[PDB]
């Protein structure tokens, strides 16, 4: 988990609009989230991980323990049952609600942080640079 720690900034985004759309977000919000480049901060204290997402539009913060289910309310205002795990070197975040699911996967690939969001048939890829 240690190489994930620190400050990272958004450098490239692909297919965010289809993802948002598949989840049910409105056009007006979509406009706004597409011009925005967030800051992500990953910290640790013992066995508790903290995840901050900062932007000029919306801000979020969660704290958890790997492999333990927790309640979360997302940036688009969903209320879900979540669990985060380490699988083959990757940081896998599973969210469940109303009988449906979405995955958020983080990978370190040649100096960089790569995030891939999957919902239904839609798949989005986002890359971050270490600040
Ligand atoms: C998440 C950045 C703030 C903008 C929110 C736009 C509304 C869509 C919500 C999608 C939920 C997760 C998106 C995470 C984006 C990211 O971390 O790169």
From Swiss-Prot:
The modification Phosphoserine is found at residues 22, 82. PROSITE patterns: FABP. GO terms for cellular component: cytosol; extracellular exosome; extracellular space; nucleus; sarcoplasm. Hexadecanoate binds at residues 126-128. SUPFAM superfamilies: Lipocalins. The modification Phosphothreonine is found at residues 7, 29. Forms a beta-barrel structure that accommodates the hydrophobic ligand in its interior. (9Z)-octadecenoate binds at residues 126-128. The keyword Acetylation applies. GO terms for molecular function: cytoskeletal protein binding; icosatetraenoic acid binding; long-chain fatty acid binding; long-chain fatty acid transmembrane transporter activity; oleic acid binding. InterPro entries: Calycin, Fatty_acid-bd, ILBP, Lipocln_cytosolic_FA-bd_dom. This is Fatty acid-binding protein, heart. Belongs to the calycin superfamily. Fatty-acid binding protein (FABP) family. Octadecanoate binds at residues 126-128. GO terms for biological process: brown fat cell differentiation; cholesterol homeostasis; fatty acid metabolic process; intracellular lipid transport; long-chain fatty acid transport; negative regulation of cell population proliferation; phospholipid homeostasis; positive regulation of long-chain fatty acid import into cell. It comes from the Eukaryota. The modification Phosphotyrosine is found at residue 19. It is found in: Cytoplasm. Keywords: Acetylation, Cytoplasm, Lipid-binding, Phosphoprotein, Transport. The modification N-acetylvaline is found at residue 1. FABPs are thought to play a role in the intracellular transport of long-chain fatty acids and their acyl-CoA esters.
């Amino acid at each position: 988990v240690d190489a994930f720690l620190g400050t990272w900034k958004l450098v490239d985004s692909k297919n965010f609009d289809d993802y948002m759309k598949s989840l049910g977000v409105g056009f007006a919000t979509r406009q706004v989230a597409s011009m925005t480049k967030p800051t992500t901060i990953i910290e640790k204290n013992g066995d508790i991980l903290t995840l901050k997402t900062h932007s000029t539009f919306k801000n979020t913060e969660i704290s958890f323990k790997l492999g333990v289910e927790f309640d979360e309310t997302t940036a688009d205002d969903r209320k879900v049952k979540s669990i985060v795990t380490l699988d083959g070197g990757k940081l896998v975040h599973l969210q469940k609600w109303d009988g449906q699911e979405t995955t958020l996967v983080r990978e370190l690939i040649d100096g960089k942080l790569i995030l891939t969001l999957t919902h239904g048939t839609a798949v989005c890829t986002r890359t971050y640079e270490k600040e």
